[PDB]
Design a protein around this ligand. Structure first.
Ligand SMILES: *[C@@H]1O[C@H](CO)[C@@H](O[C@@H]2O[C@H](CO)[C@@H](O[C@@H]3O[C@H](CO[C@H]4O[C@H](CO[C@H]5O[C@H](CO)[C@@H](O)[C@H](O)[C@@H]5O)[C@@H](O)[C@H](O)[C@@H]4O)[C@@H](O)[C@H](O[C@H]4O[C@H](CO)[C@@H](O)[C@H](O)[C@@H]4O)[C@@H]3O)[C@H](O)[C@H]2NC(C)=O)[C@H](O)[C@H]1NC(C)=O
Ligand SMILES: *[C@@H]1O[C@H](CO)[C@@H](O[C@@H]2O[C@H](CO)[C@@H](O[C@@H]3O[C@H](CO[C@H]4O[C@H](CO)[C@@H](O)[C@H](O)[C@@H]4O)[C@@H](O)[C@H](O[C@H]4O[C@H](CO)[C@@H](O)[C@H](O)[C@@H]4O)[C@@H]3O)[C@H](O)[C@H]2NC(C)=O)[C@H](O)[C@H]1NC(C)=O
Ligand SMILES: *[C@@H]1O[C@H](CO)[C@@H](O[C@@H]2O[C@H](CO)[C@@H](O[C@@H]3O[C@H](CO[C@H]4O[C@H](CO[C@H]5O[C@H](CO)[C@@H](O)[C@H](O)[C@@H]5O)[C@@H](O)[C@H](O)[C@@H]4O)[C@@H](O)[C@H](O)[C@@H]3O)[C@H](O)[C@H]2NC(C)=O)[C@H](O)[C@H]1NC(C)=O
Ligand SMILES: *[C@@H]1O[C@H](CO)[C@@H](O[C@@H]2O[C@H](CO)[C@@H](O[C@@H]3O[C@H](CO[C@H]4O[C@H](CO)[C@@H](O)[C@H](O)[C@@H]4O)[C@@H](O)[C@H](O)[C@@H]3O)[C@H](O)[C@H]2NC(C)=O)[C@H](O)[C@H]1NC(C)=O
Ligand SMILES: *[C@@H]1O[C@H](CO)[C@@H](O[C@@H]2O[C@H](CO)[C@@H](O[C@@H]3O[C@H](CO[C@H]4O[C@H](CO)[C@@H](O)[C@H](O)[C@@H]4O)[C@@H](O)[C@H](O)[C@@H]3O)[C@H](O)[C@H]2NC(C)=O)[C@H](O)[C@H]1NC(C)=O
Lengths: 119, 427, 119, 119, 119
């Protein structure tokens, strides 16, 4: 059974710097793909960051092309996201999965992590 | 107010069997992140407690957790105080580490007036319970104070090696167990004796093979040693050390009685509620727990407690709940500390598995039934050795148990110490 | 909830002099033990300095026996460490706790403080 | 290339309170001028609010001297306008640029934002 | 009973512009003296501004001689402070009282206002 434990921070002042984390267990993390997926209440899926297996390819969206950069920690199973210079349009719950955006995902989204950017 | 042992009259504890989990496991071994993972492994634990002072020892192995190497053996004592509101913990004050880590094996701790002797075994051939046919037999006792001072040089660490041994018929002695007892100025250490198999006097007709059709009669004789065609049969006992003389280090190995005579296993004796209570692990034909109180301190004679609900798991050869003689040297160390004598109530972290070593669960049982259990972890975390010790916190019984578990984000067997309070009120 | 706030500095020349600080709140500081613990990436715990409650006993390690001396300021809850004559082998993150070295520690390590001695 | 993303809608009751926003990217926002410019179908340019770089000077028109007050958010590139007490004569498309009224303009007007105050 | 109500806020970028306010009631504000006093954790009193009753004399410190200028609003009892071009050494809690720096103060310091300049 694949368990995805989302983490990170929230309820921060707009324009700060948050660091979202997501550890995993089970499947071999040394060669696989990870992606952060967020969704605002009312909207659907929205992909922001993608990381390859050997950390050779990192894709980003048009709205977050220069906001944050995803990394990889293949030594210790985790998934960091150093969110920098966020706005009010980033108030959503972020999720980690095994697909860039798609409609795919071969594991139940465990808990997620809500990031509130307001006031 | 003070952190003392089981003396006087504590508060009334739960005396009924309840399924409602009234046990509150509290962790006091909060470790730091392990960023920079490697093949670390922590084994060979030790936990003794007496009059508010504790001790600890461990051998960190880089690689495999069994057939590994030695890098450092942190042996240290300390004091027992409270973290916050009714939250006791262990505060270490002194730490000692030997120069060569691959020399010290099978230590034994004991309490004293204002010191803490650590009797360890010295070997140059590795594990003495595996290559005893070439072991010299030298023993070393390290004295560590529970309160160091400035520029003592003779009051903080005392590296002492013993000279004379009073071995009567045994060929070698070795401290084997977490801790022992003391009576004024006479320290006692748990140990195991090495005796020749051809020099053993045991008639092969007292073996409980009557109601054991699937058990050969010579299984009792073949189970007293590590292997059938071995050269030594283990024998449990205690080491006597009278420190009131200091003219010559005396080592007197007092063998255990013949009642339910099993193979040598890590034993632990402690003074609970005045009377000394003795424990002996089960690495032999008998898979049940060996518990009982001691009536004769020096001539060790333990009235064995016939518990039929608490045992330890094993391999396919000798699994849990096996009461017939079978040639097998296997098991796991799981002790228990006595918390009540009027009803003979015990408490200890015993594994709950048939042929595996997972799901460490703290259980309380008086004589033949489990009162209330509580899982210290999930049902998939492995566990090998558990050390349970209980004390008082100014009005009530508290128990700290060292349970080696498998941490999620550490990938290494970690000896997590859980602090459990004996419930006074239950459902 | 016990909160440990590490402080101090870093990025010093080989052989400089740094002063690490660590304040605390909650537990009564008038009678307790404090100890600095460091750990380099790749290694484990490494105790350097210990002090008692009444400042009557001060222990040090074999490698830092004459480098720095730990003090105590029970009037104002803190933990100073006047690191003097450091080398390249002292580049690690220092932590303050309530145990000398052990494997002990009865409070979550909050933030720590990294000290870099290079170039 | 300078991109101006206008935001904020209309369709409000006479005398309501709307908040128009306009973010930007490219040029350094820490020291520049921002101004809201509106134009109704049939008429030409109409300046309403002006602000300086250090937020030391805020100019307004005779018709909107007390309607709304322009602010500055130099931390996060944007341009807020808390329109208060509007009338039917304020039904027009608002624009953000780098000139008070003029006939000037140093960037192509991207999309704009129409505000309707009627019924 | 003299009540001093501090206001303002912190958590600003280095070199920003903040405006601290402090209203009062009770004593006659038309003829009295007001001064801003700050104190960082670890240090003591450090005055930054001073003003007379008729706004005829305005004193400042050597470190904030050209940073901000104190004003007076004798019509509506308040005390503004347009802090401009602040640095990381200005992170402290500001207070309003009836003395320049002194050790004086004839009223209990009510709440104060913490200003943070970092990151
Ligand atoms: C239980 O305890 C017993 C006793 O305490 C242990 O038995 C002891 O084993 C050790 C071996 O570890 C014996 O020591 C000597 O080992 C020498 C080995 O030399 C090298 O061996 C490794 C292999 O590398 C070499 O391989 C070949 C081998 O021929 C060479 O040609 C090649 O060039 C390499 O050099 C190297 O990695 C290592 O570093 C060594 O350099 C032996 O050469 C030596 O033999 C002497 O002694 C013999 C009598 O025992 C004698 O007949 C020979 O002629 C020669 O003089 C010796 O074996 C201990 O002697 C031995 N003790 C006893 C009492 O016999 C046992 O291992 C242990 N078991 C466990 C499980 O712990
Ligand atoms: C180690 O353990 C073994 C096994 O227990 C012991 O050997 C047994 O000893 C008992 C005695 O306690 C034996 O029981 C009986 O032995 C009788 C011996 O006969 C002679 O006895 C004395 C000498 O001792 C003579 O003076 C006397 O005149 C007899 O001539 C047997 O006659 C008995 O037989 C009965 O039982 C058998 C079944 O076994 C029936 O078939 C018979 O009809 C009769 O009813 C009885 O056996 C026992 O036999 C011994 N077993 C063995 C295998 O030898 C060892 O003594 C003990 N050693 C030590 C040092 O502790
Ligand atoms: C560990 O090692 C320590 C030693 O380092 C052991 O302690 C010793 O224990 C023995 C017990 O037998 C002590 O021997 C005692 O000696 C006493 C002598 O003191 C005075 O005796 C006379 C009094 O008249 C006695 O007459 C007879 C003699 O047997 C007695 O029966 C009477 O009751 C009277 O007491 C005086 O005239 C004389 O001048 C002496 O002052 C003796 O009285 C005791 O009966 C007993 O024999 C020995 O002294 C202890 N040693 C020390 C240093 O304290 C300890 O037991 C060891 N622990 C173990 C073995 O577990
Ligand atoms: C297993 O054993 C447990 C032993 O502690 C049981 O817990 C006890 O359960 C009983 C029955 O529900 C409680 O008795 C009642 O408690 C309520 C709530 O107490 C709270 O009151 C205020 C809020 O009003 C709150 O601030 C307090 O901190 C209390 O938490 C009371 O309102 C009732 O009058 C009555 O006393 C016990 O209080 C409770 N023990 C404790 C320590 O709270 C548990 O219920 C058992 N579980 C099962 C399944 O049997
Ligand atoms: C953990 O260990 C426990 C104790 O060792 C295990 O309990 C034992 O399970 C075995 C299973 O083989 C039992 O052994 C046999 O049980 C069956 C009973 O089933 C039949 O019973 C009657 C005949 O009595 C028959 O008519 C029915 O139709 C059934 O088919 C019989 O073959 C024998 O009687 C024999 O005893 C043990 O009896 C049982 N012990 C106890 C004390 O219950 C447990 O299963 C283990 N669990 C795991 C997960 O390994």
């Amino acid at each position: 059974e694949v368990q995805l434990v989302e983490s990170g921070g929230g309820l921060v002042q707009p324009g700060g710097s948050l660091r979202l984390s997501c550890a995993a267990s089970g499947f071999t993390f040394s060669s696989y793909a990870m992606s952060w997926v967020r969704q605002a209440p009312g909207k659907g899926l929205e992909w922001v960051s993608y990381i390859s297996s050997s950390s050779s390819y990192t894709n980003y969206a048009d709205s977050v092309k220069g906001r944050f950069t995803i990394s990889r920690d293949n030594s210790k199973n985790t998934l960091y996201l150093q969110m920098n210079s966020l706005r009010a349009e980033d108030t959503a719950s972020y999720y980690c999965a095994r697909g860039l955006a798609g409609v795919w995902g071969i594991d139940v989204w465990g808990q997620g992590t809500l990031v509130t950017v307001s006031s | 107010e003070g952190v003392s042992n089981l003396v006087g009259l504590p508060n009334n504890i739960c005396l009924q069997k309840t399924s409602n989990q009234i046990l509150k496991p509290k962790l006091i071994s909060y470790t730091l992140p392990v960023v920079g993972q490697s093949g670390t492994c922590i084994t060979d634990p030790l936990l003794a407690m007496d009059e508010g002072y504790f001790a600890y020892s461990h051998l960190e192995k880089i690689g495999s957790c069994s057939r590994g190497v030695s890098k450092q053996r942190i042996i240290g004592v300390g004091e027992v105080l409270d973290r916050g509101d009714e939250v006791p913990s262990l505060f270490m004050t002194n730490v000692w580490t030997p120069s060569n880590p691959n020399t010290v094996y099978h230590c034994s701790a004991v309490y004293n007036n204002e010191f803490y002797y650590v009797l360890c075994a010295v070997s140059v051939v590795g594990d003495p319970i595996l290559n005893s046919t070439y072991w010299s037999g030298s023993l070393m006792m390290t004295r560590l104070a529970v309160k160091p001072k400035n520029n003592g040089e003779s009051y903080n660490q005392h590296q002492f090696a013993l000279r004379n041994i009073e071995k009567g018929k045994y060929d070698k002695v070795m401290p084997y167990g977490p801790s022992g007892i003391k009576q004024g100025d006479t320290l006692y250490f748990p140990a195991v004796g090495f005796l020749v198999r051809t020099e053993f006097t045991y008639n092969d007709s007292n073996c409980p093979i009557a109601e054991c059709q699937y058990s050969k009669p010579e299984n009792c004789r073949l189970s007293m040693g590590i292997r059938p065609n071995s050269h030594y049969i283990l024998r449990s006992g205690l080491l006597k050390y009278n420190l009131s003389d200091e003219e010559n280090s005396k080592i007197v190995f007092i063998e255990i009685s013949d009642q339910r005579l099993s193979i040598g296993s890590p034993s632990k004796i402690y003074d609970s509620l005045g009377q000394p209570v003795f424990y002996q692990a089960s690495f032999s034909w008998d898979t049940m727990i060996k518990f009982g109180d001691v009536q004769t301190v020096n001539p060790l004679v333990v009235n064995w407690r016939d518990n039929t609900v608490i045992s330890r798991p094993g391999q396919s050869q000798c699994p849990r709940f096996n009461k017939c003689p079978e040639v097998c040297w296997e098991g796991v160390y799981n002790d228990a500390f006595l918390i009540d004598r009027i009803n003979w109530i015990s408490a200890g972290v015993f594994l709950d598995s048939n042929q595996t070593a997972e799901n460490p669960v703290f259980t309380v049982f008086k004589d033949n039934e489990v009162l209330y259990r509580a899982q210290l972890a999930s049902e998939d975390t492995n566990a090998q050795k558990t050390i349970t010790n209980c004390f008082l916190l100014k009005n009530k019984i508290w128990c700290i148990s060292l349970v080696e578990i498998y941490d999620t984000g550490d990938n290494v067997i970690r000896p997590k110490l859980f602090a459990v309070k004996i419930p006074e009120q239950c459902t």
